[PDB]
Design a protein around this nucleic acid. Sequence first.
RNA 1: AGCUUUGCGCAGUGGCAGUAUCGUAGCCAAUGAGGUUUAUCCGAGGCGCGAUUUGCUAAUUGAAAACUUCCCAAUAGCCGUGACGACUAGUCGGCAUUGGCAAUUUUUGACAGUCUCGAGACUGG
Length: 45
Amino acid sequence: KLMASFDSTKGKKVDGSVNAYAINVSQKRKYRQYMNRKGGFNRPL
RNA sequence: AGCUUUGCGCAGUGGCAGUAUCGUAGCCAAUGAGGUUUAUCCGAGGCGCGAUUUGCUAAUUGAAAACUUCCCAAUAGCCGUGACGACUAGUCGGCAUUGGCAAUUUUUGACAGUCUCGAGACUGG
């Protein structure tokens, strides 16, 4: 009724917000080319 | 032979450099420039105009500051699961990837500070 048998969460996935990771990255700005391209007028992807 | 003077040239230490350093082809000037001192004396440039190479390096703006770039795709531990295989439903080896790996036996920290002569003691109020 306690809800027995002492537990040890090793390897087992834990319950909740324990798994919280957060990565702050910001990549370099990929701009497009306009002047002196040799390519056709609309942008490349 | 040594010392030494004067002028010039070279290099070096240092100092100075817009009341400084010069050019002058224009004029004047020791056949005298310029002189308030000392003038029956002194003695050198004066007035104007006009200027004040080269190499190296830094920094800034600028898209670009002058010596022959960006982007996409893919390659470069263990517990389960799927097959393949091997050995007797079970076990083992390698391969593969479609969940997980901070709660006492390990990989998410009983560590940190102190003191004494390789060895121990104290504290975490």
